[PDB]
Structure 1
Amino acid sequence: MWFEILPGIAVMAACLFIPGMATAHIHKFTNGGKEKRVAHFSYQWNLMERDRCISGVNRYHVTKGLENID
């Protein structure tokens, strides 16, 4: 009956779910377990560039904390 429609909807649901989960996890993998930083304004990009210089491995997601000080 009407439940027979459900399997196609479920396959479509999985297919639609795949890209969002893929994007989230790819961002996590590329940005070191943190969300990809969002730079909608030049100040945020300047912060990202400063982090890249500070990291020393030329990767912004690498974060240097109080340990680098003194």
Structure 2
Amino acid sequence: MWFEILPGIAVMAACLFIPGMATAHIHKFTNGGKEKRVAHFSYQWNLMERDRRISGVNRYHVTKGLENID
């Protein structure tokens, strides 16, 4: 044997590992490495738009801290 069924199962598992993992990595690669922002409501979208406007490079994930208040 019954463990001879295991190899094929393993292959399937490996395939099923690819999507979610990939998504996570891609979500980190295009969002500064910090977990792509979720905007289910218009308040979160407004926060994202303000972040993009004040980033200075048209990228919401470029975060400005207290070093920007001179």
Distance 2:3 2:16 in 1: 20
Distance 2:4 2:51 in 1: 54
Identity of aligned residues (%): 99
Pairwise CA RMSD? 0.5
Distance 1:15 1:28 in 2: 21
Runs of 4+ with deviation above 2 angstroms: none
CA offsets 1:21-44 (integer angstroms, 9 cap, x no match): 000000000000110100000000
Unaligned 5+ segments in structure 1 are none
Report the Cα offset of residue 68 of structure 1: 0.2
Distance 2:8 2:57 in 1: 47
Q: Secondary structure at the match of 1:60?
A: coil
Unaligned 5+ segments in structure 2 are none
Report the Cα offset of residue 17 of structure 1: 0.5
Distance 2:25 2:35 in 1: 9
Report how many residues are paired: 70
Q: Secondary structure at the match of 1:35?
A: coil
Give the TM-score taking structure 1 as reference length: 0.98
Give the TM-score taking structure 2 as reference length: 0.98
